[PDB]
Design a binder for this molecule. Structure first.
Ligand code: CNC
Length: 337
């Protein structure tokens, strides 16, 4: 069936995160989709992020069941990992066939994708401040470090081959370089068909730059809208910044959706002026499906009891559909398969 997955934080203090399914053909929402496919097994507490990697869906939770690896189509569990570490799991970042990264509120971990052995790296620069998103690119991990913490760490690059050493120990001072990309909050990484990476700098003074990272790791910057906000490391969520392989980017700025490019990074024109009265953005806020030309938007009310998903045309901004539903879900992000 045509649709999208919604990763839910879940109701902190009351139950787990969960996976909902917005069926577009039915214009219906189905809840607890992982649970109902896996004989009552559940995600952890605060399911914040998921990642597609080598045909599997990795779903992170901050606490308890910190990682579930599942089939993207069926949601049948490959591995329900339980607690990986004494650090909160934020995101999964793929390195290769053998290894991934788990980001945290302080440090980051290497995870073996066969065994689930989790090694937390405690002496890699100022990654003690927290790690957000990241991406594997041209033999390097590009890592969103919490620039708001002590020492103002900028984006790190780390050699994947060094990270993937079979002799890696938690105290190894794995070499890094800093890129000139301040990330005072959480950012995201988009790979385009040019073979470059796109991300969002947010500086100490709150200026937002769209940053192209080249295959050489040299930078080109252009100013985004000043009213763009990253996600806060105070309560880590995936940032709103996303985009297509064609170089069309989307972000939330001043509570409105913008379509942007590298040539038009700070648009005055919105994608849409859509509101529903008393619904505000939550979680990641937006994600684009490049395969369908669809932008999905997630909202809830001020008391968190009522939820809204809206599906737009990603080119023109016209509303295709919406669905309103009750419950303490706290939507985190969208996944398209
Ligand atoms: C609103 C909110 C929320 N909060 Co606060 C945020 N942002 N929060 C707040 C505020 C509560 C009061 C208010 N203004 O309504 C506010 C700003 C004070 C707060 C505070 C904090 N929050 C924090 C975080 C990280 C979190 N918060 C969430 C619970 C995050 C929530 C999201 C979620 N998925 O649950 C959240 C969006 C919704 C809570 C709610 O209204 N639920 C409905 C209500 C009917 O249920 P309830 O059981 O009575 O809710 C109570 C608890 O949620 C409690 N509480 C709230 N946050 C925390 C955090 C912890 C660690 C603990 C033990 C309790 C809480 O306060 C609520 C009383 O109204 C969280 C899941 C968000 C996220 N997705 O990461 C997350 C906890 C993750 C985890 N598994 O540990 C802070 C550490 C932020 C910071 N750096 O200061 C801090 C810790 C407070 C503490 N207890 O020590």
């Amino acid at each position: 069936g045509k649709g999208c997955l919604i990763i839910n934080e879940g109701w902190f203090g009351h139950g787990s995160g969960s996976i909902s399914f917005y069926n577009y053909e039915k214009n219906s929402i189905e809840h607890w989709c992982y649970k109902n496919q896996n004989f009552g097994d559940v995600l952890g507490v605060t399911s914040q992020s998921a990642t597609l990697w080598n045909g599997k869906l990795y779903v992170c939770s901050k606490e308890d069941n910190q990682l579930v690896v599942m089939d993207p189509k069926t949601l049948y569990a490959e591995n329900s990992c339980g607690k990986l570490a004494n650090y909160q799991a934020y995101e999964f970042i793929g390195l290769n066939d053998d290894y991934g990264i788990i980001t945290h509120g302080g440090y980051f971990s290497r995870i073996n994708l066969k065994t689930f052995e989790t090694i937390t790296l405690v002496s890699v620069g100022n990654t003690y401040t927290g790690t957000g998103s990241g991406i594997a690119y041209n033999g390097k991990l590009i890592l969103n470090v919490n620039s708001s913490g002590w020492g103002s760490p900028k984006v790190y690059t780390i050699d994947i081959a060094e990270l993937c050493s079979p002799d890696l120990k938690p105290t190894d001072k794995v070499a890094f370089q800093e890129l000139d990309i301040a990330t005072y909050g959480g950012t995201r990484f988009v790979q385009c068909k040019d073979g470059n990476i796109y991300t969002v700098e947010t500086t100490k003074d709150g200026k937002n730059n769209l940053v192209r990272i080249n295959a050489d790791f040299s930078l080109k910057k252009v100013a985004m809208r000043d009213d763009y906000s990253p996600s806060s490391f105070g309560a880590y969520r995936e940032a709103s910044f996303c985009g297509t392989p064609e170089g069309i980017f989307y972000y939330i700025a001043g509570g409105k959706i913008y379509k942007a490019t590298f040539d038009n990074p700070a648009p005055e024109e919105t994608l849409t002026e859509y509101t529903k009265e008393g619904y505000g953005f939550y979680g990641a806020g937006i994600r684009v499906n490049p395969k369908t030309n669809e932008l999905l938007a997630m909202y809830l009310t001020g008391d968190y009891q009522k939820n809204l998903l809206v599906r737009f045309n990603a080119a023109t901004g016209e509303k295709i559909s919406e669905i309103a539903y009750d419950g303490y879900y706290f939507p985190a992000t969208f996944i398209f398969n």
